[PDB]
Design a protein around this ligand. Structure first.
Ligand SMILES: O=S(=O)(c1ccc(F)cc1)C1(c2ccc(C(O)(C(F)(F)F)C(F)(F)F)cc2)CCCC1
Ligand SMILES: O=S(=O)(c1ccc(F)cc1)C1(c2ccc(C(O)(C(F)(F)F)C(F)(F)F)cc2)CCCC1
Lengths: 294, 288
């Protein structure tokens, strides 16, 4: 079956996932909520509306007491209203990014890298590890991310179905969920994406590339030992292609975030560091979180 | 894994091409036809042509329901053709997957369009059989195609007479890995001697490379000397597959003659009534 070194690798990543992924979102508190009650620059606004409306969600908050608060966003009719969920979205993103930083911090193979390379791997993979973790709480039947007492529900349109799948970020979630991956497979995907030698500012290419290869081999070997079903043929290569697709979604998402941020600033200071909104000097929060213990 | 990095990348490209284009669970095979619920020498040969490849059909609904179809026992008549429209839809679905497979390969993509057509015309049936072998259950004599199953008619060991059936039992017995099946598909796809091929030298060179990669994969990844002649056994299976292919084309053409059933894509692949002009659907599918 799997080697002892492989069984230890899976155990360590799994232990790190459980210690740093709060799946019930119990500690997600003090977040902002939406309120109770030219030429050429108009083309920027045209793209920003396309960027936002495709990612449109309604928010549900179930109280411990049994009560339910529901927020339905406004339909697109002008400016300012389209940005109502952004402060909340930035807060959820920030809480998720902090969990991802903690995940990387507990892993010995990441801990033993120079601080600058820790910053560069985190900068390069944060969104990717966030999407992987969010996929585990995605309900593909209801088009809803189920975050404990918080729920994010995809806004139903006249297009589909077919219209929602036109958004690569949404299609990724349905395509990844269809694979019915195990916790071990998701965690090995996070490890693969985290240890990418080709991220900007990475100096220790060889060490990172060698760590990535062993996570990839461990994944292939895990699949071979646990997936004999004819449903799971080529599962390893499907996962690898999904990771390649996630890297592409990531590049598109960064450019999309900058466009929204350019006309409507919303990004938190941690988000501005990870996304490059204006190495140890330009990433103060990251450096501090990395110096702190877990 | 004692292969060249090139050889390792050649396998990776074929494996990638296979995962992208082989719907192993047949989940996208939908909207197919089903048998309804309701000169003399030509008809004599056609009866012999169909009777041997007789199958029952099983369809398992997601709800748990089972629909089963048993074919008629000759007697007439046009009833011997009851499963052809379904079969034409299944082959057409398989053929589209084979075209997509070939399209993702750099070695194939880099060849002139006319040669892409000629290779696809020559190898389509062969690559389909190779993929069907992977879903073949030699114990139950059934091709397990997701929610569909094609079960061989127990008439009445006598199946071994039909070369198309003997092929599936013999190939299955070799217990090949995915990598070996995909290298088999490449060897068959890149056949230089196919009718209408121009670049014989280039195609021959590519085939030899795939064969050497297959040979090397076997030496390095299989317990030697138990698998001493596995490469040669695979090469004999391919030779037998080529003769099965020539026979199957003649068989399909005889059936078509007296009972037209082939879809437009099948008509182009098999030569049923300027290489781009005589293969319009294929050209479109390769240009997409
Ligand atoms: O499942 S998710 O939350 C991860 C989800 C999503 C991701 C990113 C963003 C934003 O990054 C963007 F709007 F700027 F693009 C931000 F968070 F900034 F709003 C919004 C929504 C929700 C909908 C699709 C995926
Ligand atoms: O390849 S199979 O395992 C296959 C399986 C399901 C399936 F639906 C189409 C193909 C199988 C077979 C191959 C070709 C043909 C036909 O080509 C022929 F009748 F014209 F010869 C056609 F498809 F036209 F009917 C019929 C049956 C079935 C049994 C022998 C091999």
């Amino acid at each position: 079956g799997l080697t002892e070194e492989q069984r230890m690798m899976i155990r360590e990543l799994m232990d790190a996932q459980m210690k740093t992924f709060d799946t019930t979102f119990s500690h997600f508190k003090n977040f902002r909520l939406p309120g109770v009650l030219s030429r050429e620059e108009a083309a920027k606004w045209s793209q920003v509306r396309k960027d936002l409306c495709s990612l449109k969600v309604s928010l549900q908050l179930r109280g411990e007491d049994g009560s339910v608060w529901n927020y339905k966003p406004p339909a697109d009719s002008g400016g300012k209203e389209i940005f109502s969920l952004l402060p909340h979205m930035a807060d959820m993103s920030t809480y998720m990014f902090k969990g991802i930083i903690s995940f990387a911090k507990v892993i010995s193979y990441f801990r033993d890298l120079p601080i600058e390379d820790q910053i560069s791997l985190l900068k390069g993979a944060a969104f990717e590890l966030c999407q992987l973790r969010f996929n585990t709480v995605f309900n593909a039947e209801t088009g809803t991310w189920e975050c404990g007492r918080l729920s994010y529900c995809l806004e139903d349109t006249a297009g589909g179905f077919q219209q929602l799948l036109l958004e690569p970020m949404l299609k990724f979630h349905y395509m990844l969920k269809k694979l019915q991956l195990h916790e071990e497979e998701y965690v090995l995907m996070q490890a693969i994406s985290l240890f990418s030698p080709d991220r900007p500012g990475v100096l220790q290419h060889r060490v990172v590339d060698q760590l990535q290869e062993q996570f990839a081999i461990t994944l292939k070997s895990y699949i071979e030992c646990n997936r004999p079903q004819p449903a799971h043929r080529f599962l390893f290569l499907k996962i690898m292609a999904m990771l390649t697709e996630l890297r592409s979604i990531n590049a598109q998402h960064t450019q999309r975030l900058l466009r929204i941020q350019d006309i409507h600033p919303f990004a938190t200071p941690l988000m501005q560091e990870l996304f490059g909104i204006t190495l140890t000097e330009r990433h103060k929060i990251l450096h501090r979180l990395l110096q702190e213990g877990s």
